[PDB]
Amino acid sequence: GPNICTTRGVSSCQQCLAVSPMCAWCSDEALPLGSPRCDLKENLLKDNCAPESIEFPVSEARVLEDRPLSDKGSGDSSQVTQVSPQRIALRLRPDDSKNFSIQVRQVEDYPVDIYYLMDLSYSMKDDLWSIQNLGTKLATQMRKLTSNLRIGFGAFVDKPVSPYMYISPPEALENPCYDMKTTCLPMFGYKHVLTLTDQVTRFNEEVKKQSVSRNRDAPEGGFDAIMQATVCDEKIGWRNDASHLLVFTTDAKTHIALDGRLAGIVQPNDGQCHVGSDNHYSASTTMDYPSLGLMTEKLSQKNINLIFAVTENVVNLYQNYSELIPGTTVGVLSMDSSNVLQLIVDAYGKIRSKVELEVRDLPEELSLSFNATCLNNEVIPGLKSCMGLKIGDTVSFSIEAKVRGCPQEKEKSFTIKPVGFKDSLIVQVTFDCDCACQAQAEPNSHRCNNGNGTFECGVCRCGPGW
Amino acid sequence: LNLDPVQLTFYAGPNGSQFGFSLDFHKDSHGRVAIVVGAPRTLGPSQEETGGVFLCPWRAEGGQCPSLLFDLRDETRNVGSQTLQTFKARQGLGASVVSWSDVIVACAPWQHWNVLEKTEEAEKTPVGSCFLAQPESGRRAEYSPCRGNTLSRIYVENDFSWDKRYCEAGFSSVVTQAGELVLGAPGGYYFLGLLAQAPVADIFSSYRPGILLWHVSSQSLSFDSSNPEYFDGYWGYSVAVGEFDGDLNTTEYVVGAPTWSWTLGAVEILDSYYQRLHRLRGEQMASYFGHSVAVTDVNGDGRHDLLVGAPLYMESRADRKLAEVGRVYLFLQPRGPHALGAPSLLLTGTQLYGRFGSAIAPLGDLDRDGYNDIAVAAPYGGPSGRGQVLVFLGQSEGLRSRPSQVLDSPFPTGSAFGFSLRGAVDIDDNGYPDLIVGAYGANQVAVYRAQPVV
């Protein structure tokens, strides 16, 4: 009998669908007087309404691209699929809600870039000796987890400027170890040494030619180097289709934004590349250290996984930073950097052990809900992140999109993408607010007061504009 | 609320001199209010950046200002079988200026110093220095309390104790009502940070040109420490004074240490003997809590209140995302000899990377309602990131949560509009305190006149 569609007294087909996702409209010419056109689809057919004159949109979810999850991440550079589906179409009527699925997989044998960014201040004198065979040793242990591997090297000390830099005697500039009986390299901010390459013996031979410098204050300019190694894409050589690991090794504190004022530097960091053909950072003496927020922005933009491989005396410091830079990993480096290899391998496992979903370009009216299926076929409501996964695990999520009313723009799109992943799920939304009969309306109709109204969907509406 | 943003007044200096890096109101012996402006990258005699100071007379149209001349020649003295050396190149003279009575104190925090003895040296290092002037009489004096004559070998044979070679004295400055200069030296004691204090009168009477090393018996320096929590803390990055113990004969110091305890940042209130009364710890690491500190009574109970700026505070936002905006903390002094509690009010920036809280200037009572008010700078804030200054009014319970007025930068991008602030002085003698805003990136200063409330 009387339901929520009839008890609102709608005026047109458009208003009838907006009442509830269960209402329908009858555009039949031969409808009885005391018969509501805005009733359930069953009531209309019981009230002898012409089946083709029924307006009853139904929310649907149709997949467009349903490519399967690749078993191996090798081969082709690169059309691997780790998100399924990749594109689905969504139709929603006012206040209605449809659901859909999504699957993500940590593909085995996925390419990896590892850029080793090393502190070469005088405090790291003995550390340099323990990694001169790392390039081949590192290839041997990563050969088990990936067939594609490129490694590169970079070095930093601090801003070469007083008071960080020793500026006397004149011979102390070419040899900061002058007042001692030793020789060290002149001071340098950040120098790129080896572009990411699959030739691992190029790493060994470059490291054997490296040596330390020396400056005055304990904290160093490593954050300058982290920034440049991130935004200088072409020079470092990050690959568009690979996991990017930036290993940062040091034994001391780090300078941060606004520290540069002790050197006369006040210009904020611009987050742009300033490493020229000479492979040195040229803005080191004119531009302040970056801030944590700025580093986070660039690291997230270039998909760089930062790894803090620091000594036990500063672990807590870099652990506390790692919480202000989400996605960052910390490993405890020994005082000589002898466990850095196992440290890099352990960090790579923690990095590929999470599957966290992110949403981009979501309309105002839409709200999403998530059901996780991590661990083992175990549903966890209100969750969009998985933890404790191994390389080769697959997880899935259930999602419901609840639209609020009818929006103006009838065509919109948003993206569901896991953080750090390349592939993504594109949802094409279509809002079915209008009725099909509205297109063949009769403006200035003869049936409505001799040209006063418009005859659409079997009723008269006041035209434009009363 | 009632600052006039239509009819501003602009003072300008040479191109590339960073005119407006620091500023202050100055009153001559007649009470005539002028503006002292520091330009730390002004060219010197060798066509080399040394810095410079300008003394701007008050004019509604503004324009260009005459210079306050200082000696910019490197000095050398061969005495006591040693050689003393002062290097003023790139010293940044005018990186901080402060006025007291009819005396202007301008400081070059990166002026370098060295002592040679045969084949050894003390190391050419930035001890900093301050240049004192009395414009009307022409008197000049200097004060550089971190200069020493100890050879480098001694500091090494000694674990670098009491090492004042990198003080950068004058980095921050302030003068007490009695006329006691207080210099912040963030690099003192191997970048632990120290304060140096000495009466202005004695600095003048003990200084003579060419001596380079002289004694000021009434001077008072803070103390060294073996505490790793103060290591690389830049204690003295910012300084202020006020009344926080109830005794009106004693003057208390406010010191900012923006990287104290492994970049946690802190602010400390001390007595005249550097005994720590209270310590305010930072909230978030690398936020630079203590970058700027201000002292003024905002709730009108007669007790000075404390304001601390943290320009790099990252605000928590939806989906575990952090956004650097900057934050200011308000600490109301409690009745009687009690400790300052938790922050009474948190003011947070809006524009990403805006650095809300880089500078905090007390305005006095701007709208004349009975409560002192403040101004906060976001030198890269506003919807265009060109810089923005926000005014907050004092009330019985502290400050108002929302701004009463927002001054958008009249300068182009990169001016650092607001990096330096100063108010609470009626420069046009209309009965309302006015605000001067520095924009060193554009080498200019803007003056906002307060008008009756509409």
Partner: peptide, 7 residues
């Protein structure tokens, strides 16, 4: 650690 030297 006090400066750029191991502990």
């Amino acid at each position: 650690x006090r400066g750029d030297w191991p502990c």
